[PDB]
């Protein structure tokens, strides 16, 4: 005989399974199926449902997905269930351990409004069926809508050494690690085994940075699409002032990156050795008042006013293959490293265009060398004296 | 007490759920499972089955998938359930709205015979596990087998203005939009957010065009494989006369495109700014009687007879990276724009080969400039006077 004390549960008096408690009847079956993992469902050629379910979705966490409800806590929980990295770690060993976890794929099929910077932990693959392209109304992806706009929508994880030798997660929007920081231990990257395939990211107007791709060595992207082609008034368009900011990401590849921006499209700083940006399509949403934008992250030597599609400095030497750059005051601003002019400016066959032939310069090169191959597409501005 | 009138249903008497009707018993459970969406099946770490099923398949619509039965209506129903765009629309706002719908991924794992031109609507991602490569018998993908062979197997959507001011979906095999048409309002593309991975397309012998990539700006492809290596005799091989016809597709990227053709491999016309074709493998199925093939879509300046692997004109300037071209009379025929010779012919390291060294010309350049990088692979024809 089996004695069951008052206040017992099947889980606390032997568990459910052979030799212990066995579910019997329809009510039990319903609950067993409702709270299971799919192991009760057989599949072909063999095995069970749980054997083949490997992707995660925000819907598993009850995200509304209408771009209205604040789905922040659900997105964080989904991410946490994959790799939950504490914001303060004791030492280098602890932070590095988080890059050694199981990687999981996430599928985003609706629109998720969020209001705090999302930090992607290592071991995360994100996918959406197709990438946005000058899309008028984003229907799938992420919509950053914070109170504090002096922030980034998405950011990779980089830990900064504290006075006591401990490491805290970086949460400063303007911060980016340098090759020096990584070398001398002041910064430790916690960004690896991260893959993006078609992520659409829109932001409330005025958000400072779309994506902070910091410390993402070896991390890859395909079809990353930033910003919404909301309408003619860029002042109210759902796109960030700065699309992407990247540093310490050697060996990182961005394939067919799409960026709609207001102030700066993409910025690459410091160590990005061997990184490539192929077939990028980076455009300001029209060039109305573009000449009045003030670059946010730029080398000291660049003091001109005007929006910049691609900015690179401090020794960064990303390879730009066949980029398409539209409606920019400055297509490219590139400065070599201050010390020795290191950092080759490399652009192969840029497709440069601007409505009404409005432009200041295509290649604003500072203290540097370059190899550029033109493809018969381009122009110089309307000012007969200063544009070239 | 609850009174239920004769002829009632749970729906007509309060509905199902808390405080209303609750299903009970095995018979109810079986029907609930059969007619539900998987919401009764819990999955890990939390949530239910319906939360992670996002991919569509023709089997959901009971397609036979044997390459024999006509699966046309079922393929069309699947595409329609994703984005049902009317063949006739009121105005530009109307046609443009259909590019703002949720995108859905489709997985094709069997072989589907169809008999009418399939029109892919915006917001569709097509996937097949692997791509064909000179395969003799196509086991997965689409098989176009129409009564009227003077048609296309697959086409993107482009709307043409009518005299009354309304727009109708183009169904003309020869039509292709130009920059003018787009600027005039005479044509409005309805092809955005389209992604193809490993699609295998085979067609009945005599079919004019394999794929009409018209207006596919920003649309992408990887492993798109056209034509079957049926047998030695090309007159009965299951491949189209013209593999791919493309226009108004600026920023589109075709990665590892594979085309087995009879008359022309790929044709690029008009605006294709910034578009790229990487690692394409284009080949006629043997050069037998190739010199007799008459190009269908070509510039006025090209009057020679012979099959052409790649044809480009009217200002199109697609970047061809490492293409592999085989068994063609003419590897590339390229014409600069009529008015000003615009449109650079760019080919980097083409791998050109042909059986028995049969060939007329590799680069047939008309009113144009070009930048070509040879990789030590090539040849010139057997005619000691005319071949170069």
Numbering used by the authors:
A (entry chain C), B (entry chain A): 131 to 518
Give the article text.
Analytical gel filtration of purified TSP1 revealed a single homogeneous peak at ∼252 kDa based on regression analysis of gel filtration standards (data not shown), suggesting that similar to all other tailspike proteins with known structures, TSP1 forms a trimer in solution (predicted 82 kDa monomer, 246 kDa trimer). The TSP1 trimer assumes an elongated rod-like shape of approximately 170 Å in length and 75 Å in diameter at the widest region.
The crystal's asymmetric unit contains the biological homotrimer. The N-terminal domain (amino acid residues 12–155) that putatively attaches to the virion forms the spherical head of the trimeric assembly. In addition to electrostatic and hydrophobic interactions, oligomerization of the three head binding domains is enhanced by the coordination to the Zn2+. The C-terminal domain (amino acid residues 166–769) forms a bent 3-stranded right-handed parallel β helix. A short α-helix (amino acid residues 155–165) forms a “neck” that connects the head binding and receptor binding domains. The receptor binding domain may be further divided into two β-helical subdomains D3 (residue 166–562) and D4 (residues 624–769), intervened by a non β-helical region (residues 563–623). This bending produces a 13 by 16 Å channel along the trimer axis with openings to bulk solvent between each of the trimer subunits. This cluster includes a pair of adjacent glutamic acids that share a proton, located on the same subunits of TSP1, Glu456 and Glu483.
